Amino acid sequence: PFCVILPEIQKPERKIQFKEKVLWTAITLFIFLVCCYWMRVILASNRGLMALGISPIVTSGLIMQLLAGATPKDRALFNGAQKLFGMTITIGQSIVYVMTVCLLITIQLFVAGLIVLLLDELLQKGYGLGSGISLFIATNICETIVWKAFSPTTVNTGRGMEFEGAIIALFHLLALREAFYRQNLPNLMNLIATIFVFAVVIYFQGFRVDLPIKSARYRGQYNTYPIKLFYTSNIPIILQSALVSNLYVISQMLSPVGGLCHYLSPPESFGSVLEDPVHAVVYIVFMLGSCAFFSKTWIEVSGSSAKDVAKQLKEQQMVMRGHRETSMVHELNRYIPTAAAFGGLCIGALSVLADFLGAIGSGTGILLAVTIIYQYFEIFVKEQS
Amino acid sequence: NTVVPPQRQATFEYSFIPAEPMGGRPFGLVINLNYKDLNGNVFQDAFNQTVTIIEREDGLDGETIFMYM
Amino acid sequence: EEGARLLASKSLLNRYAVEGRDLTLQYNIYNVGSSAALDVELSDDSFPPEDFGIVSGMLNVKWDRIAPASNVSHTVVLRPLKAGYFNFTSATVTYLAQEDGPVVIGFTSAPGQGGILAQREHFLDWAAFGVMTLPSIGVPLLLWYSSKRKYD
Amino acid sequence: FVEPSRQFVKDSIRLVKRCTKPDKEFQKIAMATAIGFAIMGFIGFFVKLIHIPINN
Numbered sequence: 001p002f003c004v005i006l007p008e009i010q011k012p013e014r015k016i017q018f019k020e021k022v023l024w025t026a027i028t029l030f031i032f033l034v035c036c037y038w039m040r041v042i043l044a045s046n047r048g049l050m051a052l053g054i055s056p057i058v059t060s061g062l063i064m065q066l067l068a069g070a071t072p073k074d075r076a077l078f079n080g081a082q083k084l085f086g087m088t089i090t091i092g093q094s095i096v097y098v099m100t101v102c103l104l105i106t107i108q109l110f111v112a113g114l115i116v117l118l119l120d121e122l123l124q125k126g127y128g129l130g131s132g133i134s135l136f137i138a139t140n141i142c143e144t145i146v147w148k149a150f151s152p153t154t155v156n157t158g159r160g161m162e163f164e165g166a167i168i169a170l171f172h173l174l175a176l177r178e179a180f181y182r183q184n185l186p187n188l189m190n191l192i193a194t195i196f197v198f199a200v201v202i203y204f205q206g207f208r209v210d211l212p213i214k215s216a217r218y219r220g221q222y223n224t225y226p227i228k229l230f231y232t233s234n235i236p237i238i239l240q241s242a243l244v245s246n247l248y249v250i251s252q253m254l255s256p257v258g259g260l261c262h263y264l265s266p267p268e269s270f271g272s273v274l275e276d277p278v279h280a281v282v283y284i285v286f287m288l289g290s291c292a293f294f295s296k297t298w299i300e301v302s303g304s305s306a307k308d309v310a311k312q313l314k315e316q317q318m319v320m321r322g323h324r325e326t327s328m329v330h331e332l333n334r335y336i337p338t339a340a341a342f343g344g345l346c347i348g349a350l351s352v353l354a355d356f357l358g359a360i361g362s363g364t365g366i367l368l369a370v371t372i373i374y375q376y377f378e379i380f381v382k383e384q385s
Numbered sequence: 386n387t388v389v390p391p392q393r394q395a396t397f398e399y400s401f402i403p404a405e406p407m408g409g410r411p412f413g414l415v416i417n418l419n420y421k422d423l424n425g426n427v428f429q430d431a432f433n434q435t436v437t438i439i440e441r442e443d444g445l446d447g448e449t450i451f452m453y454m
Numbered sequence: 455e456e457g458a459r460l461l462a463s464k465s466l467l468n469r470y471a472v473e474g475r476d477l478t479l480q481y482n483i484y485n486v487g488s489s490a491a492l493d494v495e496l497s498d499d500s501f502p503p504e505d506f507g508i509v510s511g512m513l514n515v516k517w518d519r520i521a522p523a524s525n526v527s528h529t530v531v532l533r534p535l536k537a538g539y540f541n542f543t544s545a546t547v548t549y550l551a552q553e554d555g556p557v558v559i560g561f562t563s564a565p566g567q568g569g570i571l572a573q574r575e576h577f578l579d580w581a582a583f584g585v586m587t588l589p590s591i592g593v594p595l596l597l598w599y600s601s602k603r604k605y606d
Numbered sequence: 607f608v609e610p611s612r613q614f615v616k617d618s619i620r621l622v623k624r625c626t627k628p629d630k631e632f633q634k635i636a637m638a639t640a641i642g643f644a645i646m647g648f649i650g651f652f653v654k655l656i657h658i659p660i661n662n
Binding site: 393 | 457459461551553554555556558
Binding site for chain 1: 614617618620621622624625626627628635636639640642643646647650651653654655656657658661662
């Protein structure tokens with residue numbers, strides 16, 4: 001009864017040109033990147049007042065929606081309740097920073113309390129660069145694209161000159177040893193391997209089983225219901241394996257590349273590392289099995305199983321050519337359950353191939369990037385006739 | 386903890402292999418005599434030396450890696 | 455006038471020479487200085503008593519000579535007892551330099567383990583192990599050839 | 607008892623046989639997708655190269 005004293009915000013209800021979204025919604029992230037758990041950084045951000053602000057904003061929405069699902073009265077409690085947790089999430093990272101007179105440092109958080117709260121609701125309207133995935137692709141591609149520009153702008157030398165760049169250093173070396181030591185700034189060699197990963201993934205992205213579908217009333221044009229080989233967005237599958245990896249690491253750190261328990265760890269080496277295969281081969285086995293396990297369970301909960309798809313098609317009045325409505329499920333069951341199990345296995349195997357080859361971005365994460373950039377590609381092509 | 390009377394000498398050996406590549410850069414190699422009496426304090430009575438190496442290949446089998454590249 | 459003192463490190467040369475081979479530990483010296491050292495001491499402190507036996511009990515050899523004339527003994531004959539895993543632990547070579555007097559405590563310890571299996575029931579061992587089972591090599595082939603001659 | 611495993615891989619095989627894949631069609635479809643990916647990556651490179659000149 002005490003929650004009916006907070007108003008909400010308004011939204012536009014008119015057609016908006018795509019140019020405005022592609023030009024304006026893609027900017028204003030520099031303020032968050034002014035400063036640009038190092039292994040754990042790949043989750044949302046790197047700095048520990050800036051913090052991350054990616055997970056908390058969507059977490060507030062998830063909490064409000066689950067509270068609603070646990071009506072104008074409840075509608076007014078949606079936009080108003082996010083401000084309740086908006087202060088909690090901002091102070092949450094700061095107090096964590098304190099544990100692992102310092103009270104004066106809390107003044108720095110004054111600005112950061114509301115920096116990302118305003119942007120949370122506005123970016124969703126328009127092109128569709130929401131769900132925080134637009135933030136992830138921008139920073140993930142950044143570490144790949146600005147990697148080339150780092151070499152000319154790098155001032156640190158270490159042992160060899162770098163202020164003038166390292167891609168072309170014929171005067172410095174020459175005779176010339178083009179096969180230098182790629183232990184720092186591997187910009188010369190990692191680009192060779194990563195482009196192979198880009199080509200292979202897009203090839204497997206286009207795999208799908210096309211199911212003949214027709215309107216239940218009109219004779220004529222036949223459409224196909226596409227069941228993608230992955231059949232699951234990369235974020236639901238890869239995050240469920242990324243989160244558990246992060247959860248494992250933080251647990252061991254509280255309770256691993258050096259001076260840490262090495263019972264479970266991803267392999268990392270130039271070329272190949274092999275002392276006891278009982279560790280390396282087990283890692284991929286648990287990685288592949290978990291991905292298929294995560295992908296197979298996601299469709300059971302996300303309303304994308306064979307049973308749910310048929311209900312969607314029945315609602316849209318779409319039928320198979322020569323099957324009854326009840327036979328929709330059986331034909332879908334021929335491909336849907338096995339595509340999730342095998343698609344999750346394949347995307348996990350692509351990560352292992354990406355990690356082993358040592359591509360840009362340390363292998364993992366680029367699978368998320370290539371899929372989402374493809375995800376908006378289907379919008380881009382269809383909006384251009 | 387070597388003990389030597391005056392006007393005599395004792396020989397000791399050390400061996401260092403630079404893990405990081407190096408060339409044309411000597412390091413400290415300072416000789417400090419740590420002799421202590423019953424008081425329990427050590428007085429520092431301290432030259433430098435040189436080291437250099439030419440780098441061609443490294444690793445478990447550097448030659449095959451460079452040939453493959 | 456220079457250093458280059460004793461460097462008698464124990465290396466893993468063969469680990470297999472012949473059946474019943476007794477280890478012949480040898481010590482190498484490389485010195486160019488014009489001075490001399492005194493009061494050599496060869497002690498077999500760190501040796502495996504279970505797999506290698508020393509000739510003169512607990513070897514404690516004192517030489518105290520620097521001369522091209524001769525040396526007391528540098529061919530230590532370790533006599534093994536039975537086949538198994540042998541470890542080349544170390545060999546204690548200290549010098550009681552008459553110039554100074556205190557012991558130059560130096561012994562080269564290496565984790566070199568080698569396997570020599572039973573010579574009779576590496577090369578001879580594994581060969582004898584492989585040739586042990588005679589019927590399994592011939593009898594199936596004998597039956598195959600009998601079937602061939604009955605069918606051809 | 608290992609039969610479900612023998613089932614699963616087999617089903618996977620069937621999916622790969624049933625899935626539509628770019629065959630000549632490989633050239634066309636892969637080239638179009640690669641051109642799209644390259645131009646999108648170029649846009650990403652352009653948009654994320656604006657804050658550098660502050661340090662030079």
